[PDB]
């Protein structure tokens, strides 16, 4: 349940992203600041698209063979 699960995970990840903008090392600074933040974004978006569409499904499985054990 809870569409607010996605929004809560979004708040946590967007808090961990702004916290890394002011914690990235100085040496390769734009490489740390763009690789780490933009992989949390795509790793979040794929989880959010997979967790939705299973929240309120329209289609159930069938599995016609299925040994009665």
């Amino acid at each position: 349940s809870s569409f607010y699960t996605v929004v809560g995970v979004f708040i946590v990840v967007s808090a961990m992203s702004v916290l890394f903008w002011i914690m990235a090392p100085k040496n390769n600074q734009a490489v740390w600041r763009s690789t780490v933040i933009l992989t949390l974004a795509m790793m979040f978006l794929m989880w959010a698209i997979t967790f939705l569409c299973q929240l309120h499904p329209l289609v159930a499985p069938r599995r016609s063979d299925l040994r009665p054990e």
């Binding site: 390769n28 600074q29 734009a30 490489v31 763009s34």
Partner: protein, 47 residues
């Protein structure tokens, strides 16, 4: 001190060299052993 130049490009500068003839063959090796000058062709339209 040295910038990163991976978000955008590095900042360039055009430099003019007044080189005497008696050290013209000498200073070319100095600018070749450090590989960070791109020369531009000033004798264009010359065969």
């Amino acid at each position: 001190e040295k910038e990163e130049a991976i978000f955008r490009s590095a900042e360039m500068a055009l430099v003019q060299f007044y080189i005497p003839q008696e050290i013209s063959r000498d200073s070319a090796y100095t600018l070749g052993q450090l590989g960070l000058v791109q020369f531009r062709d000033l004798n264009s339209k010359v065969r």
